[PDB]
Design an enzyme around this catalytic site. Structure first.
Site, PDB file in Angstrom:
ATOM      1  N   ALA C   9       0.761  -1.320   0.032  1.00 36.05           N
ATOM      2  CA  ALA C   9      -0.080   0.074   0.065  1.00 36.05           C
ATOM      3  C   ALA C   9       0.665   1.391  -0.122  1.00 36.05           C
ATOM      4  O   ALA C   9       0.408   2.292   0.355  1.00 36.05           O
ATOM      5  CB  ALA C   9      -1.099  -0.073   1.284  1.00 36.05           C
ATOM      6  N   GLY C  11       3.084   2.569  -2.598  1.00 38.99           N
ATOM      7  CA  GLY C  11       3.664   3.172  -4.045  1.00 38.99           C
ATOM      8  C   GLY C  11       3.219   4.704  -4.089  1.00 38.99           C
ATOM      9  O   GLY C  11       2.198   5.165  -3.591  1.00 38.99           O
ATOM     10  N   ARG C  15       0.586   7.538 -11.776  1.00 39.58           N
ATOM     11  CA  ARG C  15      -0.496   7.660 -12.814  1.00 39.58           C
ATOM     12  C   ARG C  15      -1.908   7.920 -11.987  1.00 39.58           C
ATOM     13  O   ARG C  15      -2.732   8.343 -13.134  1.00 39.58           O
ATOM     14  CB  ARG C  15      -0.457   6.067 -13.442  1.00 39.58           C
ATOM     15  CG  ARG C  15       0.554   6.023 -14.404  1.00 39.58           C
ATOM     16  CD  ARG C  15       0.796   4.602 -14.753  1.00 39.58           C
ATOM     17  NE  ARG C  15       1.368   3.689 -13.686  1.00 39.58           N
ATOM     18  CZ  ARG C  15       1.116   2.327 -13.525  1.00 39.58           C
ATOM     19  NH1 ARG C  15       0.559   1.854 -14.573  1.00 39.58           N
ATOM     20  NH2 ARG C  15       1.626   1.768 -12.575  1.00 39.58           N
ATOM     21  N   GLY C 139       3.405 -10.581 -17.985  1.00 36.52           N
ATOM     22  CA  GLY C 139       4.140 -12.129 -17.817  1.00 36.52           C
ATOM     23  C   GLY C 139       3.360 -13.334 -18.326  1.00 36.52           C
ATOM     24  O   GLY C 139       2.297 -13.412 -17.636  1.00 36.52           O
ATOM     25  N   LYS C 350     -32.855  12.307  13.752  1.00 35.06           N
ATOM     26  CA  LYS C 350     -31.745  12.226  14.474  1.00 35.06           C
ATOM     27  C   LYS C 350     -31.613  11.661  15.711  1.00 35.06           C
ATOM     28  O   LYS C 350     -32.301  12.303  16.652  1.00 35.06           O
ATOM     29  CB  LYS C 350     -30.725  13.603  14.153  1.00 35.06           C
ATOM     30  CG  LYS C 350     -29.215  13.164  14.625  1.00 35.06           C
ATOM     31  CD  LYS C 350     -28.689  14.352  15.302  1.00 35.06           C
ATOM     32  CE  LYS C 350     -29.463  14.366  16.935  1.00 35.06           C
ATOM     33  NZ  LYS C 350     -28.406  14.999  17.765  1.00 35.06           N
TER      34      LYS C 350
HETATM   35  O1  LIG Z   1       7.837   0.274  -4.075  1.00 41.65           O
HETATM   36  C1  LIG Z   1       6.420   0.084  -3.942  1.00 41.65           C
HETATM   37  C2  LIG Z   1       5.774  -0.134  -5.139  1.00 41.65           C
HETATM   38  C3  LIG Z   1       4.588  -0.603  -5.183  1.00 41.65           C
HETATM   39  N1  LIG Z   1       3.918  -0.722  -3.958  1.00 41.65           N
HETATM   40  C4  LIG Z   1       2.498  -1.056  -4.000  1.00 41.65           C
HETATM   41  O2  LIG Z   1       2.421  -2.121  -4.981  1.00 41.65           O
HETATM   42  C5  LIG Z   1       1.254  -2.145  -5.759  1.00 41.65           C
HETATM   43  C6  LIG Z   1       1.625  -2.228  -7.282  1.00 41.65           C
HETATM   44  O3  LIG Z   1       2.326  -1.011  -7.695  1.00 41.65           O
HETATM   45  P1  LIG Z   1       1.852   0.005  -8.818  1.00 41.65           P
HETATM   46  O4  LIG Z   1       3.007  -0.058  -9.866  1.00 41.65           O
HETATM   47  O5  LIG Z   1       0.567  -0.700  -9.439  1.00 41.65           O
HETATM   48  O6  LIG Z   1       1.486   1.497  -8.068  1.00 41.65           O
HETATM   49  P2  LIG Z   1       2.516   2.664  -8.126  1.00 41.65           P
HETATM   50  O7  LIG Z   1       2.352   3.277  -6.616  1.00 41.65           O
HETATM   51  O8  LIG Z   1       3.883   2.258  -8.193  1.00 41.65           O
HETATM   52  O9  LIG Z   1       1.754   3.508  -8.940  1.00 41.65           O
HETATM   53  P3  LIG Z   1       2.913   4.277 -10.549  1.00 41.65           P
HETATM   54  O10 LIG Z   1       3.790   5.317  -9.766  1.00 41.65           O
HETATM   55  O11 LIG Z   1       3.480   3.177 -11.076  1.00 41.65           O
HETATM   56  O12 LIG Z   1       1.711   5.005 -11.190  1.00 41.65           O
HETATM   57  C7  LIG Z   1       0.519  -0.887  -5.368  1.00 41.65           C
HETATM   58  O13 LIG Z   1      -0.208  -1.058  -4.530  1.00 41.65           O
HETATM   59  C8  LIG Z   1       1.750  -0.265  -4.599  1.00 41.65           C
HETATM   60  O14 LIG Z   1       0.943   0.695  -3.419  1.00 41.65           O
HETATM   61  C9  LIG Z   1       4.729  -0.414  -2.733  1.00 41.65           C
HETATM   62  O15 LIG Z   1       4.216  -0.779  -2.017  1.00 41.65           O
HETATM   63  N2  LIG Z   1       5.888  -0.184  -2.742  1.00 41.65           N
HETATM   64  O1  LIG Z   2     -27.980  17.622  16.981  1.00 40.83           O
HETATM   65  P1  LIG Z   2     -27.838  18.033  15.403  1.00 40.83           P
HETATM   66  O2  LIG Z   2     -29.099  17.908  14.651  1.00 40.83           O
HETATM   67  O3  LIG Z   2     -26.851  17.431  14.791  1.00 40.83           O
HETATM   68  O4  LIG Z   2     -27.576  19.901  15.484  1.00 40.83           O
HETATM   69  C1  LIG Z   2     -27.971  20.752  16.541  1.00 40.83           C
HETATM   70  O5  LIG Z   2     -26.544  21.284  16.893  1.00 40.83           O
HETATM   71  C2  LIG Z   2     -25.813  21.973  15.823  1.00 40.83           C
HETATM   72  C3  LIG Z   2     -24.632  22.547  15.978  1.00 40.83           C
HETATM   73  O6  LIG Z   2     -23.981  22.659  14.863  1.00 40.83           O
HETATM   74  C4  LIG Z   2     -26.957  23.158  15.385  1.00 40.83           C
HETATM   75  O7  LIG Z   2     -26.554  23.802  14.410  1.00 40.83           O
HETATM   76  C5  LIG Z   2     -28.374  22.530  15.267  1.00 40.83           C
HETATM   77  O8  LIG Z   2     -29.365  23.944  15.155  1.00 40.83           O
HETATM   78  C6  LIG Z   2     -28.804  21.657  16.014  1.00 40.83           C
HETATM   79  O9  LIG Z   2     -30.050  21.072  15.686  1.00 40.83           O
END
Ligand SMILES: O=c1ccn([C@@H]2O[C@H](COP(=O)(O)OP(=O)(O)OP(=O)(O)O)[C@@H](O)[C@H]2O)c(=O)[nH]1
Ligand SMILES: O=P(O)(O)O[C@H]1O[C@H](CO)[C@@H](O)[C@H](O)[C@H]1O
Ligand SMILES: CC(C)(COP(=O)(O)OP(=O)(O)OC[C@H]1O[C@@H](n2cnc3c(N)ncnc32)[C@H](O)[C@@H]1OP(=O)(O)O)[C@@H](O)C(=O)NCCC(=O)NCCS
Ligand SMILES: CC(C)(COP(=O)(O)OP(=O)(O)OC[C@H]1O[C@@H](n2cnc3c(N)ncnc32)[C@H](O)[C@@H]1OP(=O)(O)O)[C@@H](O)C(=O)NCCC(=O)NCCS
Ligand SMILES: CC(C)(COP(=O)(O)OP(=O)(O)OC[C@H]1O[C@@H](n2cnc3c(N)ncnc32)[C@H](O)[C@@H]1OP(=O)(O)O)[C@@H](O)C(=O)NCCC(=O)NCCS
Ligand SMILES: O=c1ccn([C@@H]2O[C@H](COP(=O)(O)OP(=O)(O)OP(=O)(O)O)[C@@H](O)[C@H]2O)c(=O)[nH]1
Ligand SMILES: O=c1ccn([C@@H]2O[C@H](COP(=O)(O)OP(=O)(O)OP(=O)(O)O)[C@@H](O)[C@H]2O)c(=O)[nH]1
Ligand SMILES: O=P(O)(O)O[C@H]1O[C@H](CO)[C@@H](O)[C@H](O)[C@H]1O
Ligand SMILES: O=P(O)(O)O[C@H]1O[C@H](CO)[C@@H](O)[C@H](O)[C@H]1O
Ligand SMILES: [Mg+2]
Lengths: 450, 450, 450
Positions: C9, C11, C15, C139, C350
């Site tokens: 997660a 990268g 793009r 690949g 609410k």
């Molecule tokens: O070095 C990396 C490369 C990729 N990833 C994660 O591997 C997965 C595939 O990586 P991608 O090649 O599809 O995403 P990217 O972040 O490299 O995007 P571009 O710059 O190429 O457009 C993605 O989910 C990425 O987050 C890493 O965690 N580290």
């Molecule tokens: O309880 P709610 O409906 O989220 O909202 C309540 O508190 C808010 C504070 O922002 C006020 O603006 C609303 O007049 C009041 O009804």
């Protein structure tokens, strides 16, 4: 050298089955002829003339002073329509493009290049062409050995080999303006429809040994001419495909591109999310990190960074940063919401300034009014701004609390740090740090219903 | 000669995976069997019998007295279902068509011609056929040298040459009524499903040397039979394509035909614009030059020339010329809006007559009431029409001004040229040219919050 | 044996043209990485590690304690990213799957089988493959004579015969965890991008004579990796197609599957009708025989049998049997509607409990409140629950009638069988069987406007 345009907007439009002029039907909330005018003007054109018919007040109404107008009494063909522009353009020099008012997808970049290609070749005329998968019925571009136009050959006149040509005339041309008006005098209407056909000027220019060039556009969709309601929905869909693809290549998320309608004058910042069914038209500017929630309609508005619009209607309004609107709210013209504002469900804002941090959370109408910073407007509150003749202004100060179901009878000023008790009808100004109450006390009739 | 119809509506519907009878599922807001009944009756049929199963109260509830009913105790096949109609039809003479209740796209014009083709050939039976791109599994039409039916051959029985036939039986037939009921006695259920199959009567008629004709419909979609939820959405989409194309060929603009749902009983005048997401059903009449704005729902209503409906819900209502409704308004049954009326956001109108020029601009409820010409109803105003047992009427005269957040406690009459002050609860009649006020005066406690 | 997952997660996501991490962009209202986490956890995985980059607070914020986290300082490739998990997983035994956070369509059933196929073959590694119509650039799976992996060959290295292979590596793998971390030490970045590529571990395992298996998924769409906004809308459409088809095969009517968005965690009972434009997300349970009306949005809610929701917004709410909501209503978190309740247009609920049979028919706000059985809340009524610092509770008893435009100033208790007169502001508790009134009497100034 100067540049002119003639937009043809006077045809009967019989295939539209309409009582209005064809070029007034809309794509992306704007008349087709206005799309064409925008593109022509964007191409650098010094003067525009629009050819109009009888009862054209609506067309002239719509374009205003952005165009000159020439009246075509009888609809005798495209070359006759161009002739009506003589009073404005006969003695002008330079390049003149002729574009039909029913070609709303035409791009200003294609017109810029048509004109530049024409001028750089020092041509007498240049035809804008395109390659189409099915060219049946269109005039085919027949080029000579040097790559310039030999002729445009109609289907009825073409050899079998010529019918295989996929390059077709768009019906859009650039002309040397003096040559255009000299040759128009020689075009005849000796044909079955009795019409004077603009392409006939090109054959007159060719027969005199003049140079006619060809500029081919790579986007065949932009030369589409709308003649009926089916084609009008096809033009809406082509424009939708064009703009949606543009924004998605520029960092905008569009959840459902098939159901989302973004007009050509809308700008959208990156990381913004457009949910399904959203329609955004007019001259709208949307910042970064915005969420436009499902089935909203936004016209001619400014929405700043981080704002959230949920299933709401917004017209000629401005919404500051991180402000939340909806669901089911309406911002009417002149609504001005500051930053970190809340406008909740069933709230209507018109010609009203909501300063930073103000909250109007439900079931309220705020019109002709200023609500100061951080002020809380309770549920059911109304600026009573109208007497039946005139409108009056309401002013509420900062950090105030306007109770629920309060009527503020304008003109009235509410100070800072004020509490207005729920259920009150307020007719007199209320100074800072005060409590105002205008309601009957409670009578409880115990056992009355026993 | 007389004409009869049998509609088959008693099948188990196992592939629907439903607890309701299949023919009660809807297309364009109406049960499939009601679409079929409308078409049959539109074809000139004198008497309709609908075959129903156990617990059919909902079907009989829905068709009412527009059909006779015959009960099928066990679901033993289409020929057995037709046999249940004997009590109503055995001794009738003339033409009898048999149509399944799950064929909601069937058109009255195709049934008219099926019947006329049958009668003019003096046939014993006529099969409605269609040409389909993939005929696998359907009975193939095998014609003899004279062009009449030689047999309908099932896939399992066909030679390879016969399998190449694309003309298929729709399962819809016209019969000489006396022959139909005579041959039904001879149909056997000697097959794997144990079922009595209606097409078997045609082979009995053929084996006796009787004439069986074939009438081919050019629209294969209209004979589609809905057996599951996927096919039900396909029928909604086929009906959408049919009606949208009809209106667009008749001068109606439909911005997005894929997202717009117009029922088959809706009429729409030319130059009207239907925006995306609109759903119009029931018996609705829309005049010319109307705008139906995005994501509105309109049922069983009349909308006159030049009216504008914006993102609103309208049921069993009438809207006069040039009247504006919405955004986010609701017109409930019996709402009657005159011409040049305004009904703004968050307004609900029920069983109420708004005369020409009246304005109800926001956040109001008007029920069981008459609002006179040009009268202005302020924001937040309520006709208090309900006591918990009964409903009472409110009458407001012409050119009056009802202030904001006013409660009109019915029964009450407000005269002409009256001003009712904002915040008032009105319990007593108010004569012409008067001011009525019912609210506490304002107490301002200056410095109370210091 | 235990099972682990590493989700990539971190990268740059260049793009995407975003300022946010790619895996945080949403499909069906949830970040892509959360879809992946749900599937991984649903596959039986004992421990999840998510590889995150700098400024990952948003990712860690979103997954919370459902995942461990490892920081990748520089984005040097998928194999380098997996190496960052060493602290959590280096000395673990068992199977480890590696899945990119941008593969939101991956199904828990495909991961279950990938893992089972890996373990039952006692493989060192198993690649998840798929057959694709256009395999250019992927690949290719090259199998040996025993059907196990011989190699994954990149386009640039493939013979013409190998380029014809349609079976491609998805980039998702299962590993013997001890082997994975032993081989990662030997992966080099001697290539043009300077990157450590995860597939290189498979070639290290192969060169050592270890077994690498191949498990092919039959749904090529589930291995789609989202790299730009166009692909993100394609993933929304693929998920829409998957869920809509599921519900339609399980007795749910969906009128327009192209415009209806149902999230993957929604359950829907049979004979329910989903109208066009509806969006249902979060953990939502919808019973049988429900109608969800056009253009509604429902999130994280429970809707019981026979309920009717019309063009409304519903969040974190519960709706009992046969209850009717809308059009244009909003249920906010903690709204609890009993059975046979009515919540009409322009009503906001609410944190409020509406007991069976209660009615709130229009233009009202009910917050922090209990409304007893069969009680009628009139138009315009407001629970005034807020003082600007704290919230207070309103209690209304059973079979009571709260008049129109009433303000209930909390904390306040209204008894059973009470009538509160229209236009009243109620500050004091009202006992059973009583009448409460707090309003000025009417003054009529006859002839005042003459
Ligand atoms: O070095 C990396 C490369 C990729 N990833 C994660 O591997 C997965 C595939 O990586 P991608 O090649 O599809 O995403 P990217 O972040 O490299 O995007 P571009 O710059 O190429 O457009 C993605 O989910 C990425 O987050 C890493 O965690 N580290
Ligand atoms: O309880 P709610 O409906 O989220 O909202 C309540 O508190 C808010 C504070 O922002 C006020 O603006 C609303 O007049 C009041 O009804
Ligand atoms: C009026 C309101 C503010 C007073 O609440 P409260 O202060 O707890 O109740 P109190 O009885 O102490 O009222 C305070 C003063 O207003 C006076 N007053 C109260 N009700 C009055 C009434 N109908 N008419 C005239 N004066 C009134 C009281 O006499 C008292 O005056 P005093 O201090 O000179 O004796 C409260 O009822 C209210 O309206 N809250 C609305 C919150 C809201 O709407 N948020 C959105
Ligand atoms: C009541 C209203 C109409 C009066 O505005 P105004 O005429 O400028 O103010 P005035 O003080 O001159 O009131 C006129 C008369 O009503 C009387 N009156 C005013 N307020 C009153 C009240 N709460 N209770 C009883 N009588 C009242 C005044 O005494 C005066 O009577 P008089 O002429 O016999 O002396 C105004 O406050 C209003 O409600 N406008 C609403 C517009 C709207 O709602 N549009 C939608
Ligand atoms: C107040 C209401 C209930 C009374 O209607 P009503 O009983 O036909 O009219 P009445 O004159 O007989 O009023 C009954 C009692 O309330 C008294 N009262 C009436 N209006 C009053 C007022 N503004 N202030 C104080 N007391 C009042 C009356 O004096 C009478 O008292 P009493 O029996 O001791 O003499 C009615 O006007 C109302 O508000 N209906 C609302 C229905 C609704 O909102 N549904 C949703
Ligand atoms: O005589 C004319 C003919 C055409 N035009 C303009 O030229 C362009 C192309 O003209 P069209 O042929 O496409 O539109 P039309 O008005 O003739 O409609 P039909 O009856 O054929 O259905 C259109 O924009 C038209 O307005 C004129 O201005 N005058
Ligand atoms: O015995 C029958 C069989 C069918 N029908 C009616 O004939 C028409 C065609 O019958 P179908 O075969 O299409 O529907 P079904 O009810 O048998 O559904 P499945 O179990 O096969 O999924 C349907 O409209 C049905 O109601 C009867 O009335 N009685
Ligand atoms: O200023 P607005 O909001 O446009 O409207 C104002 O004048 C209108 C005249 O038609 C009235 O109907 C409205 O009650 C009033 O609020
Ligand atoms: O006449 P209507 O608008 O249908 O409804 C009326 O009777 C209803 C009975 O349920 C009440 O809930 C409403 O407060 C009232 O306005
Ligand atoms: Mg109110």
């Amino acid at each position: 050298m100067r540049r002119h345009a003639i937009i043809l907007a006077a045809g009967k439009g019989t295939r539209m089955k309409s009582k209005k002029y064809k070029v007034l039907h809309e794509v992306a909330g704007k008349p087709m002829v206005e799309h064409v005018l925008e593109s022509v003007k964007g191409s650098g054109v010094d003067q525009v003339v629009t050819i109009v018919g009888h009862g054209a007040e609506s067309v002239k109404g719509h374009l205003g002073e952005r165009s000159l107008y020439s009246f075509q009494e009888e609809q005798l063909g495209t070359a006759h329509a161009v002739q009506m522009a003589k009073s404005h353009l006969e003695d002008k020099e330079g390049t003149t493009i002729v574009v039909c008012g029913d070609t709303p997808l035409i791009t200003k970049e294609t017109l810029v290049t048509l004109i530049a290609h024409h001028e750089d070749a020092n041509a007498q005329a240049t035809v804008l062409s395109a390659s189409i998968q099915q060219p049946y019925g269109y005039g085919r571009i027949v080029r000579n050995a040097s790559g310039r136009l030999e002729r445009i050959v109609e289907e009825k006149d073409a050899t079998q080999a010529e019918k295989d040509i996929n390059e077709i005339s768009s019906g859009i041309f650039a002309f040397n303006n003096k040559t255009l008006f000299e040759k128009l005098t020689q075009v005849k209407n000796d044909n079955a429809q009795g019409e004077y056909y603009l392409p006939d000027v090109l054959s007159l220019i060719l027969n005199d040994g003049g140079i006619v060039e060809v500029y081919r556009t790579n986007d065949v969709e932009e030369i589409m001419g709308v003649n009926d309601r089916v084609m009008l929905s096809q033009a809406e869909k082509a424009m939708q495909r064009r703009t949606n693809h543009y924004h998605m290549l520029n960092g905008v998320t569009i959840i459902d591109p098939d159901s989302t309608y973004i007009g050509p004058d809308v700008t959208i910042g990156s990381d913004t999310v457009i949910e399904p069914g959203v329609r955004i038209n007019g001259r709208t500017e949307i910042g970064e990190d915005v969420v436009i929630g499902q089935y909203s309609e936004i016209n001619n508005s400014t929405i700043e960074n981080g704002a959230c619009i949920q299933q709401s209607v917004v017209n000629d309004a401005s919404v500051g940063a991180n402000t939340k609107v909806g669901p089911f709210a309406q911002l009417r013209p002149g609504a001005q919401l500051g930053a970190d504002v809340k406008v909740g469900n069933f709230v209507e804002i018109k010609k009203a300034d909501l300063k930073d941090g103000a909250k109007v959370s439900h079931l309220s109408y705020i019109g002709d009014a200023v609500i100061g910073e951080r002020t809380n407007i309770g549920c059911g509150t109304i600026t009573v701004n109208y007497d039946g003749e005139n409108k009056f202004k309401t002013i509420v100060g900062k950090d105030s609390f306007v109770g629920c179901n309060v009527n503020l009878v304008a003109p009235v000023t509410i100070g800072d740090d004020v509490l207005v008790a729920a259920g009150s009808t307020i007719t007199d100004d209320v100074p800072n740090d005060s409590l105002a109450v205008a309601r009957a006390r409670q009578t409880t009739k115990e056992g009355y219903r026993k």
